[PDB]
Write a structure and sequence with these properties.
Structural class: mainly alpha
Order of helices and strands: HEHHHEHHHH
Shape: globular
CATH superfamily: Clp, N-terminal domain
CATH topology: Double Clp-N motif
Strand content: under 5%
Number of strands: 2
Helix content: 55-70%
CATH class: Mainly Alpha
CATH architecture: Orthogonal Bundle
Strand order of the largest sheet: 1-2
Distance between the termini: 28 Å
Radius of gyration: 13 Å
Number of helices: 8
Length: about 140
């Protein structure tokens, strides 16, 4: 669909992370890393306030996974599709970083969700943190 400048930065960072960790496939966990690495968007701020850090997430991801042209996994694709729905529901025509994270949370399956679970973050709490930031004055 249509992606904000910061969302596009997340997509670039996600692809870079997939390469860095020796993967042909850009999966949900690489989208997660892309979100926190972007640093300045609502998604990175929400993840930061949950007590997650780039290094700790990086490290945890390597623990669960291991480590030619990168392609999105089918689940990553579903996450990106869902981001458009999450944006529309929040009254945005452009997908922002918050909507990629909400799409990731909505997906609820895959490697990113398992990483979040190991860090003791429930998907409901992740969603509430994002929504709290968005509703913030």
């Amino acid at each position: 669909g249509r992606f904000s400048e910061r969302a596009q930065k997340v997509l670039a960072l996600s692809q870079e992370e997939a390469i860095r960790l020796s993967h042909h496939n850009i999966g949900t966990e690489h989208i997660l890393l892309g979100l926190i690495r972007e640093g300045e968007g609502i998604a990175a701020k929400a993840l930061q306030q949950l007590g997650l850090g780039s290094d700790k997430l990086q490290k945890e991801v390597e623990g669960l996974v291991g480590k030619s042209t990168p392609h999105y996994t089918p689940r990553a694709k579903k996450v990106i599709e869902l981001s458009m729905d999450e944006a529309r529901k929040l009254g945005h025509s452009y997908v922002g970083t918050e909507h990629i994270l909400l799409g990731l949370i909505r997906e609820g399956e895959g490697v990113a969700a398992r990483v979040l679970n190991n860090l003791g973050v429930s998907l409901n709490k992740a969603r509430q943190q994002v929504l709290q930031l968005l509703g913030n004055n």
